[PDB]
Amino acid sequence: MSIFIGQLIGFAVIAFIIVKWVVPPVRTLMRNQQEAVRAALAESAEAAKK
């Protein structure tokens, strides 16, 4: 039972470290990819209009 609380605390630490250091960069990369593809689509529309 005690080991259960211990590994819950460990998982809380894991979640904190994740959300605080791994989440920001991966989210930024995801936003960069989304912006790049959106810009590509916008360029396609602009080129067709041109």
């Binding site: 590509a40 689509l41 360029e43 396609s44 080129a47 067709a48 041109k50």
Partner: protein, 60 residues
Amino acid sequence: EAMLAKTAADNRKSAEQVAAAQADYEKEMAEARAQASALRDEARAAGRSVVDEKRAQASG
């Protein structure tokens, strides 16, 4: 990828057209100008011939 290639080709084609429109413009501008100049030249030649034959018949 096909969309990216199509966008590049469309930009290239728009650049080509903004030049080809003016190219054909100037081409038939020059065609009309040359035709008009030829019409004027033949009119002048006809007038010269007419006055020359008038000279000849009047002298006779």
